[PDB]
C-alpha cells in the first residue's frame, strides 16, 4: 500500500528510534518490496516471497520498536510471539498456528476499530436527522425542490445549532425503538444503530484476512532460544521441534481461523535473537533459507540514552511534561538534568543487570515519583528538573547496588 521509498521509511522510523540505521534500512527494504511486488506481472507475483529478516542484538536496544513502528507505519497487522512459548507444547502448549490466528484476531480488532472512524461522522450526521425529525416532524409529503427540504434550514437549523451543546431534552423515537428515552440518550442509542447499519459486516471480516495475507507482520522474539545448545539433548529436540513447527508458516501454508482460511505465503517475518549462546547458523537449514536478511543492532551508549530521552516524538520526557501539564504544572528538563538521568541509567545497567533502554523508564519514574504525587497541589508552578534535582533524587539509590536490584 504505502508508496514510501525505503529512504522515506527510514526517515519516518527515525522519528521513534535512535540509531540502528542498518536495522532500519533492512526493515524498510522489506516494506518497499511489498509494493515492488504488486508492480510485477501475474507469474512473478507468486514467485517473489517476503524477504524475512533476523535481527541480532542485545536486549532492549530497539528491535521490537523498529518492528512495531514499521507495521504501524504501513497500518499492518502486527503480532509479537515469544518463540519459547511453544517449547512446552511437547507436553501440551499453544499450537504454532495460533500465531496466525491471533494475528487475525487483532487484525480484526483493528479493521473493526478503524471502521468506527469513518462511521463516526456520517454515523452521527444522519443520526441527527433522527432526533430532528421529532423536533420538526417533516411535512406530509416533502416537496421535491432539493431546497424545499432545506427550508427550515431555518426552524430546522435552530434545533441543529441548539443541538450543538444544549440538549439533554427528553424525547421519543423509533426493532427500531418506539420508546420514550431522553435526547441525550436518543442521541446515544442513535450513534450505534445508524453507525452499524452503515457497516458492511461481511466485507469487514473478509478484510482482516486481506490484511493478514497482504501486510501481516509476525515478530518472533528470541528465536535464538530455540536453537540447539551443548547443554543437553532432550530439550534440543523440542527446541528444534518448534523450528519445524514454525517452518510451514514462513515457507507458505494455510491456517484455519475462526474468521476464515488465511494463507501465510506473504506475511513478513521478523525474527529476533541475542545469539550469545547459539549462532544464526544453528537455526535449521530450512529456516535459515527463509531468513535471507541478517542485520545487527548495536548496544546503546549514554549518548544514545540522552537522545532517546528527549528526541523521539512523544518521547518519555515529552510525555511527562504532557502529563504534568494536565495538572497545571510546567515541567522543564535542563540539558544536564537529562545528561545525568541517562548517566544514572547506564550506571545501573553496568553496575547490575543490563536491560538496555528499558532502564530509562524506571530511572525516570523513580525520579518523578515526588512531583507526580504533588503535581495537583503544585498547580500553576514552574518546576525545573536540573542536574541538582536529579542527583538529589537518584544518586543514593544508584550507588546502593542491592537497593538498585529492587527499586530501579
Ligand X SMILES: Nc1ncnc2c1ncn2[C@@H]1O[C@H](COP(=O)(O)OP(=O)(O)O)[C@@H](O)[C@H]1O
Site for ligand X in 358-377 (CB under 6 A): 358
| 180, burial (CB in 10 Å: exposed 0-12, middle 13-18, buried 19+) | exposed
In 208-363, DSSP assigns E strands to: 217-221, 254-257, 260-263, 268-273, 293-296, 330-333
Residue 276, C-alpha cell as written in the block: 550469545
Q: Of 231-250, which residues contact ligand X (CB under 6 A)?
A: none
Identity of the residue, 19 or 77, whose beta carbon is nearer to ligand X in the bound complex: 19
Q: What residues are designated binding site?
A: 18, 60-65, 221, 286, 358
Least CB distance from residue 78 to ligand X, whole Å? 12
Under the criterion CB under 6 A, does residue 337 sit at the interface with ligand X? no
24 touches ligand X by CB under 6 A: no
Residues 257-296 binding ligand X (CB under 6 A) are 286, 289
- Residues in 3-22 that interact with ligand X by CB under 6 A: 17-20
The C-alpha atoms of residue 324 and residue 19 are separated, in whole angstroms, by 29
Q: Are strands 382-385 and 330-333 parallel, antiparallel or unpaired?
A: parallel
Residue 77 binding ligand X, by CB under 6 A: no
Question: Do strands 293-296 and 53-56 pair parallel, antiparallel, or not at all (unpaired)?
Answer: parallel
- 70 interacts with ligand X by CB under 6 A: no
State the number of CA atoms in the 13 A half-sphere of 27 facing the CB. Answer: 36
- On whether the CB atoms of residues 333 and 383 are closer than 8 A, the answer is no
The residue among 21 and 374 lying less far from ligand X, judged by its C-beta, is 21
Is 64 a residue that touches ligand X (CB under 6 A)? yes
Nearer to ligand X, 62 or 216 (CB): 62
**How far apart (Å, rounded) are the C-alpha atoms in residues 78 and 68?**
7
Pick the closer one to its own copies by CB: 84 or 159.
Answer: 84
Task: Report 216-235 residues binding its own copies (CB under 8 A).
Answer: 222, 235
Beta bridge partners of 273: 56
136 binds its own copies (CB under 8 A): no
CA–CA separation, 404 and 397 (whole Å): 6
Which of 293, 356, 364, 404 lies at the binding interface for ligand X (CB under 6 A)? 356
Does residue 294 belong to the site contacting its own copies (CB under 8 A)?
Answer: yes
With CB under 5 to 8 Å by kind, the binding choice for 347 among ligand X, its own copies, none is none
Residue 191: burial class (beta carbons within 10 Å; 0-12, 13-18, 19+): middle
- In the complex with its own copies, the residue whose CB is nearer, 113 or 154, is 113
Q: Which residues are annotated as a binding site for ATP?
A: 18, 60-65, 221, 286, 358
C-alpha cell at 127: 443520526
Q: If binding is defined by CB under 8 A, does position 60 make contact with its own copies? A: yes
**Which stretches of the chain bind ligand X, using CB under 6 A?**
17-20, 59-65, 286, 289, 308, 312, 356-358
Amino acid at each position: 500500500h504505502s508508496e514510501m521509498t525505503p529512504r522515506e521509511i527510514v526517515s519516518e522510523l527515525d522519528k521513534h528510534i535512535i540509531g540502528q540505521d542498518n536495522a532500519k534500512r533492512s526493515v524498510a527494504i522489506a516494506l518497499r518490496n511489498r509494493w515492488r511486488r504488486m508492480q510485477l506481472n501475474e507469474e512473478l507475483r507468486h514467485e517473489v516471497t517476503p524477504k524475512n529478516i533476523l535481527m541480532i542484538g542485545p536486549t532492549g536496544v530497539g528491535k521490537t520498536e523498529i518492528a512495531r513502528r514499521l507495521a504501524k507505519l504501513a497500518n499492518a497487522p502486527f503480532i509479537k510471539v515469544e518463540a519459547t512459548k511453544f517449547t512446552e507444547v511437547g507436553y501440551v502448549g499453544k499450537e504454532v498456528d495460533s500465531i496466525i490466528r491471533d494475528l487475525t484476531d487483532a487484525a480484526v480488532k483493528m479493521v473493526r476499530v478503524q471502521a468506527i472512524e469513518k462511521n463516526r461522522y456520517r454515523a452521527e450526521e444522519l443520526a441527527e436527522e433522527r432526533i430532528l425529525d421529532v423536533l420538526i416532524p417533516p411535512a406530509k409529503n416533502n416537496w421535491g425542490q432539493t431546497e424545499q427540504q432545506q427550508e427550515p434550514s431555518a426552524a430546522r437549523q435552530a434545533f441543529r445549532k441548539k443541538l450543538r451543546e444544549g440538549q439533554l431534552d427528553d424525547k421519543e423515537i423509533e426493532k427500531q425503538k418506539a420508546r420514550k428515552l431522553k435526547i441525550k440518550d436518543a442521541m446515544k442509542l442513535l450513534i450505534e444503530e445508524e453507525a452499524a447499519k452503515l457497516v458492511n459486516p461481511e466485507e469487514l471480516k473478509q478484510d482482516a484476512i486481506d490484511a493478514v495475507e497482504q501486510h501481516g507482520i509476525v515478530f518472533i522474539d528470541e528465536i535464538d532460544k530455540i536453537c540447539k545448545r551443548g547443554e543437553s539433548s532432550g530439550p534440543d529436540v523440542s527446541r528444534e521441534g518448534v523450528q519445524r513447527d514454525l517452518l510451514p508458516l514462513v515457507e507458505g501454508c494455510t491456517v484455519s481461523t475462526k474468521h476464515g482460511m488465511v494463507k501465510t505465503d506473504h506475511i513478513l517475518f521478523i525474527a529476533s535473537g541475542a545469539f550469545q549462546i547459539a549462532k544464526p547458523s544453528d537455526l535449521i537449514p530450512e529456516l535459515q533459507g527463509r531468513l535471507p536478511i541478517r542485520v545487527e543492532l548495536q548496544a546503546l551508549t549514554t549518548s544514545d540514552f540522552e537522545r532517546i530521552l528527549t528526541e523521539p516524538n512523544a518521547s518519555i520526557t515529552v510525555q511527562y511534561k504532557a502529563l504534568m501539564a494536565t495538572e497545571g504544572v510546567n515541567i522543564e528538563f535542563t540539558d544536564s538534568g537529562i545528561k545525568r538521568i541517562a548517566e544514572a541509567a547506564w550506571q545501573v545497567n553496568e553496575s547490575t543487570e543490563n536491560i538496555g533502554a528499558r532502564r530509562l523508564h524506571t530511572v525516570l519514574e523513580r525520579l518523578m515519583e515526588e512531583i507526580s504525587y504533588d503535581a495537583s497541589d503544585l498547580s500553576g508552578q514552574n518546576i525545573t528538573i536540573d542536574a541538582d534535582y536529579v542527583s538529589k533524587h537518584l544518586d543514593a539509590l544508584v550507588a546502593d547496588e542491592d537497593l538498585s536490584r529492587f527499586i530501579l
